[PDB]
Design a protein around this ligand. Structure first.
Ligand code: SF4
Lengths: 65, 197, 460, 113, 61
């Protein structure tokens, strides 16, 4: 039980990290930076025509609960 | 039948895998040394990674375990395709099967039997590819297959379909013997044999 | 000669002495005083769990204050140049003239991402755009200094032969030549941290990492058994020298799997395979367990210890809370005070993530990793890349990754090669050691505590 | 004794087929490592098995001889004893719990409470 | 002109750029753009909104 919970948590965390990485590299087109505040700028992308946004917000909601 | 089912299943799986690998019936590159194949294996045995062979052997072992209630002998044949002649015969005895604990001891016995089998197979000459294939033969006590379809077998679930497809997949049929060590444990009283030429 | 000749020369000439088996030699006592003292720095509350900007601000302020103090200690008034007088500037836009000036401000570079990791992440996002377009659409290779008021192109030669990563605070002092590009003559670094005094019978420490015990590689188990036999004094037979290894330090990567497709059975098998080795090594030599990037723990840097579970039931006598000096499960970063010697060990995720980028400046060898480690030690920041390494809510108003006290030895693991480097910064002495993986080229590092001399042990 | 050891070795080699190591002999006979190596060499003297020998060079280097024909740095060899005897070709040992109540040559400074 | 030529659903700038030019452009709310334009520090936000509008203008061509 505990091992399965840990595995699920690790999968969710890896998915969230991959989504954050791809969104940050996507916003790199505008910021042209890779350091800090890049994810902060990319954290406001509310484009409803991109499926990565829905997956990212779903992962965030799942991690917040 | 509570726990000997899985143990006999993994034993037959390792048996078939080692037989197929050490006799060069399939390319060794398709085999990999592993320990988990949906069941904890007692030794790092070379198991194939092909889907068709996987469920093929799975259904074979399932039918064998279902018929175990009347089967007392299980043989794996190795025959050539240019001529339908038996070249090698590996026998696995099931004398009364000690039918109706310490799983580590069962795993140790299975490991010893598999090591004896590998030692016996290592002394055989190299076997070539190109249609050096294998078969399967069983010996029951009192049973008759191929006659359950006399009422059209109106199906209602998956169990009946599996029973029908298992009872219909069998067809009736008609040197240096080398004995090996089997499993001398209480619940699993299994013996091993072998044939050549 | 043949193997038979060597066997007849060695086994027949066996001494068969000193093996009393009733009065054995006691291992050298080595105690990590940081076990129960106070203030576990990297121990966070998982239940507590953006704060990245808050952390950025505090880090920038601390770094700015330290850089200002270093400038006051180095570029104080009366530090005249060759011909011109030196001056100070508060804003980056203030330095404009034929006079040298010193200013503080962050560094900004390109720091492009690697293409391998790009496709590796792309293959698992369910319809993401071509990230390769994000780098190719733009027209690159230039270092600038941002001080919240502007950016100036830092052109020069002394910057070329130095490594840099965006987000570092530098107090370089130069002078413009023909445009809005400031030259460089010297480079300043923040004030030196206080270091514990080196103490003046003595033992050694064994460091091993990169085990990666998986259900597919059987050679790893053979190497593990060989290492267990060699540490037990059964292989070398030189008890006078083997008993000097007080404890073993597993830095990380003991179990290696792909979290995408794994079940509970494989992890349990690998943990029980490790448990055996553990049960054979424990009653002879102490052990220090540390997690890693491929271990069943958090993927961020400050990883909590694994658990009380995930080990064989026969190890319950060690998890009773009383026998902690025999086996100690610690976080990923830790500052071990081995008999007064402060050594910091990290899983190597920081250096691996820094190398995961492609910087189009600064001109994967051993010297490059050593230089990156030296820069990390000088910058007093263990994690230079915040979002790729660090996680949310690391600390409140006091970051743990910013260095507060310089250690004696900096131990990094999960590296392809092995190497050492003794760096001198502000009259201090730091010895960086690169621990390689145990799966491929499974070398064993033996670190002494009397002269800080590292030795290697190969196992084939 | 050289009599019970050979009996146990041939039993665990032919009756219950499994690779035998000097550690098992030390645990069964309660003897030292050098005595175990001497007994292993004596059993190698006076054949349906495969010997696995290891050689410890200088600089704390340990390797496993595989070709048994080209031994590099034969002058730097400080010790060379037979490690195990396996009847099969693939080594692949197995490890279990061992109760070293009195078969330990190096004891830790701390005792389990 | 895009609706008369192409046959899609959203009829937005980002959807058109992704379905015609194969380029996905992020989208920010008006409040975020205003907060980025009125930041005395953090020139990254100014560069971000500048490149945003420049790309929105070049995609029109
Ligand atoms: S999701 Fe928002 S950020 Fe991530 S790619 Fe699509 S647009 Fe760019």
């Amino acid at each position: 039980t505990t091992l399965s919970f840990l595995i699920k948590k690790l999968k969710r965390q890896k998915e969230y990290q991959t989504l954050k990485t791809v969104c940050r590299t996507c916003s790199y087109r505008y910021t042209s930076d890779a350091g800090i505040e890049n994810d902060h700028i990319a954290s406001k992308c509310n484009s409803y025509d991109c499926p990565v946004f829905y997956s990212r917000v779903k992962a965030e909601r799942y991690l917040r609960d | 039948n509570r726990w000997v089912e899985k143990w006999l299943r993994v034993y037959l799986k390792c048996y078939i895998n080692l037989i197929l690998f050490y006799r060069n019936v399939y390319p060794p590159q398709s085999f990999d040394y592993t320990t988990y194949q949906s069941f904890n294996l007692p030794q790092f045995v070379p198991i194939n990674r092909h889907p068709a062979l996987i469920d093929y052997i799975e259904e074979l072992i399932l039918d064998v375990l279902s018929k175990l209630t009347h089967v007392y002998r299980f043989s794996i044949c190795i025959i050539n395709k240019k001529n339908d002649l038996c070249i090698e015969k590996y026998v696995l005895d099931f004398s009364e099967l000690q039918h109706v604990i310490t799983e580590t001891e069962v795993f140790d016995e299975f490991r010893s039997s598999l090591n004896s089998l590998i030692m016996h197979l290592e002394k055989l000459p190299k076997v070539n590819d190109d249609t050096i294939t294998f078969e399967a033969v069983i010996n029951a006590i009192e049973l008759e297959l191929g006659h359950k379809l006399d009422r059209n077998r109106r199906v209602d679930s998956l169990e009946e379909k599996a029973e029908i497809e298992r009872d219909s997949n069998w067809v009736k049929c008609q040197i240096k013997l080398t004995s090996l060590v089997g499993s001398d444990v209480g619940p699993l009283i299994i013996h091993q044999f072998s044939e050549k030429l | 000669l043949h193997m038979d000749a060597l066997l007849t020369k060695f086994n027949e000439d066996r001494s068969l002495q000193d093996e009393n088996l009733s009065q054995p030699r006691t291992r050298v006592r080595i105690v990590d005083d940081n076990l129960y003292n106070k203030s576990n720095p990297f121990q966070l509350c998982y239940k507590k769990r953006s704060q990245y900007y808050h952390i950025y601000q505090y880090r920038l302020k601390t770094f700015r204050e330290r850089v200002l103090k270093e400038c006051d200690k180095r570029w104080d008034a009366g530090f005249t140049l060759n011909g011109q007088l030196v001056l100070k500037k508060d804003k980056v836009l203030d330095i404009q003239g034929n006079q040298p000036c010193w200013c503080v401000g962050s560094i900004y570079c390109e720091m492009k991402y690697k293409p391998n990791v790009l496709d590796e992440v792309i293959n698992d996002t369910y319809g993401a755009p071509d990230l390769t377009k994000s780098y190719t659409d733009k027209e690159s290779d230039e270092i600038m200094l941002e001080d919240e008021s502007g950016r100036v192109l830092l052109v020069g030669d002394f910057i070329r032969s130095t490594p840099f990563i965006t987000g570092v605070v530098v107090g370089i002092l130069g002078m413009e030549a023909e445009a809005g590009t400031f030259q460089v003559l010297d480079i300043c670094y923040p004030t030196p941290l206080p270091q514990n005094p080196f103490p003046a019978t003595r033992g050694k420490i064994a460091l091993v990492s990169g085990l990666n015990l998986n259900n597919t590689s059987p050679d790893r188990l053979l190497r593990l058994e060989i290492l267990r036999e060699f540490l037990m004094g059964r292989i070398n037979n030189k008890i006078d020298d083997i008993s000097l290894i007080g404890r073993l330090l597993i830095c990380g990567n003991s179990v290696d799997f792909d979290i995408k497709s794994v079940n509970k059975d494989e992890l349990m098998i690998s943990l029980t395979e490790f448990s055996k080795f553990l049960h054979n090594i424990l009653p002879s030599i102490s052990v220090d367990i540390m997690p890693g990037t491929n271990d069943p723990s958090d993927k961020s840097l400050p990883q909590q210890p694994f658990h009380k579970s995930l080990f064989d039931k026969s190890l319950e006598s060690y998890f009773n809370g009383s026998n902690k000096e025999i086996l100690n499960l610690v976080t990923n970063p830790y500052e071990f005070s081995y008999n007064g010697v402060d050594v910091l060990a990290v899983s190597g995720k920081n250096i691996n993530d820094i190398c995961k980028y492609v910087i189009p400046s600064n001109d994967d060898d051993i010297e490059h990793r050593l230089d990156l480690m030296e820069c990390t030690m000088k910058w007093q920041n263990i994690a230079p890349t915040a979002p790729d390494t660090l996680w949310c809510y690391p600390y409140t108003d006091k970051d743990p990754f910013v260095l507060d006290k310089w250690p004696h030895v900096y131990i990094v693991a999960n590296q392809p090669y092995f190497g050492t480097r003794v760096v001198e910064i502000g009259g201090k002495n730091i010895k960086i050691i690169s621990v390689p993986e145990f799966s491929s080229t499974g070398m064993i590092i033996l670190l002494d505590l009397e002269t800080l001399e590292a030795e290697t042990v190969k196992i084939d | 004794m050289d009599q019970k050891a050979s009996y146990f070795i041939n039993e665990k080699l032919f009756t219950e087929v499994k690779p035998v190591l000097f550690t098992d002999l030390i645990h069964h006979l309660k003897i030292g490592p050098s005595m175990a190596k001497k007994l292993m060499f004596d059993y190698y003297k006076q054949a349906k098995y495969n010997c696995v020998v290891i050689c410890c060079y200088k600089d704390q280097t340990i390797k496993i001889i595989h070709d048994l024909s080209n031994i590099p740095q034969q002058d730097s060899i400080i010790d060379c004893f037979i490690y195990a005897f396996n009847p099969m070709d693939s080594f692949i040992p197995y490890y279990d719990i061992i109760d070293q109540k009195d078969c330990l040559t190096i004891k830790n400074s701390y005792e389990l409470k | 002109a895009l609706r008369s030529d192409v046959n899609l659903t959203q009829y937005t700038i980002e959807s058109a750029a992704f379905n015609i030019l194969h380029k996905r452009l992020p989208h920010f709310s008006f409040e975020s753009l205003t907060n980025m334009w009125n930041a005395k520090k953090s020139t990254t936000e100014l560069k971000t909104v500048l490149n945003y509008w420049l790309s929105r203008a070049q995609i029109n061509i």
